[PDB]
């Protein structure tokens, strides 16, 4: 079974690293970074990293939140709730990852880096509670790799 924690940690590690930050500075949860490239989990991680890059590029071409530690949970959950309210698809799942990554990077920039591990928690919880039934019914993360990898 695919760990959603592992995908969150990998994706947020990637987005932080693109801005010069290291995940390990903000959490003691480690990622499995030694698994073979041929493994399905490595393929999922790579597909999600690249899909996030492509999402962020397209978002920037087409398109205030004022995150604070006291409002971050509600702002995260309300955006994610509206994102998925009329349905789930893999592109909206990529958007969910990119949104979390953006919040994390911004949190470190604004001296609110305690939020990095908390955003990661909220993302994994949302995946495990609310996205996992759809993921399982739509061919799992292997199907994501077929479509995006």
């Amino acid at each position: 079974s695919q760990s959603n924690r592992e995908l969150v940690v990998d994706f947020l590690s990637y987005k932080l690293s693109q801005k010069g930050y290291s995940w390990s500075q903000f959490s003691d949860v480690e990622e499995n970074r030694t698994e073979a490239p041929e493994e399905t989990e490595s393929a999922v991680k790579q597909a999600l990293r690249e899909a996030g890059d492509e999402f962020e590029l397209r978002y920037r071409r087409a398109f205030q939140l004022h995150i604070t530690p006291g409002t971050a949970y509600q702002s995260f959950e309300q955006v994610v709730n509206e994102l998925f309210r009329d349905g789930v698809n893999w592109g909206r799942i990529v958007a969910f990852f990119s949104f979390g990554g953006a919040l994390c990077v911004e949190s470190v920039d604004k001296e609110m880096q305690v939020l990095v591990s908390r955003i990661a928690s909220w993302m994994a919880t949302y995946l495990n509670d609310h996205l996992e039934p759809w993921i399982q019914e739509n061919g799992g993360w292997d199907t994501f790799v077929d479509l995006y990898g």
Partner: peptide, 25 residues
């Protein structure tokens, strides 16, 4: 209004990169 606006922009781009799964019906 910013939460709705942001969610709909994320959703629009999400749908734009998506619609990749094959419908078998």
């Amino acid at each position: 209004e910013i939460i709705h606006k942001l969610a709909m922009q994320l959703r629009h781009i999400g749908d734009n990169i998506d619609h990749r799964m094959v419908r078998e019906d």
